[PDB]
A = this chain, B = another copy of it.
């Protein structure tokens, strides 16, 4: 599986990145019965003022299919 995490800019050294990676991997293996080798994870940081684009492209379009809806809401 390929996991993509989009978040606002964070301070994360290489150890924080590895730690985050290991906890996601763990969850994926347990829930989807994946192999560690089958897992890839991307971490993309979105600038403070640019979330509207993520909401219009990733969130809004799949609002109902979302296994976890956003708490907030930003539709015109």
Contact = CB atoms under 8 A, between A and B. Distances in A.
Contacts of A7: 1-2, 32, 34
Interface residues of A, number: 48
Contacts of A27: 20, 23-24, 26-27
This protein's copies in its complex: 2
Interface of A: 1-8, 10, 16-21, 23-28, 30-44, 54, 58-59, 62, 65-72
28 contacts: A1-B5, A2-B7, A2-B54, A2-B59, A3-B5, A4-B58, A5-B28, A7-B32, A7-B34, A10-B33, A16-B31, A17-B67, A20-B67, A21-B68, A23-B30, A23-B31, A24-B24, A24-B68, A26-B27, A37-B70, A38-B70, A40-B59, A40-B70, A41-B68, A42-B65, A42-B66, A43-B66, A43-B67
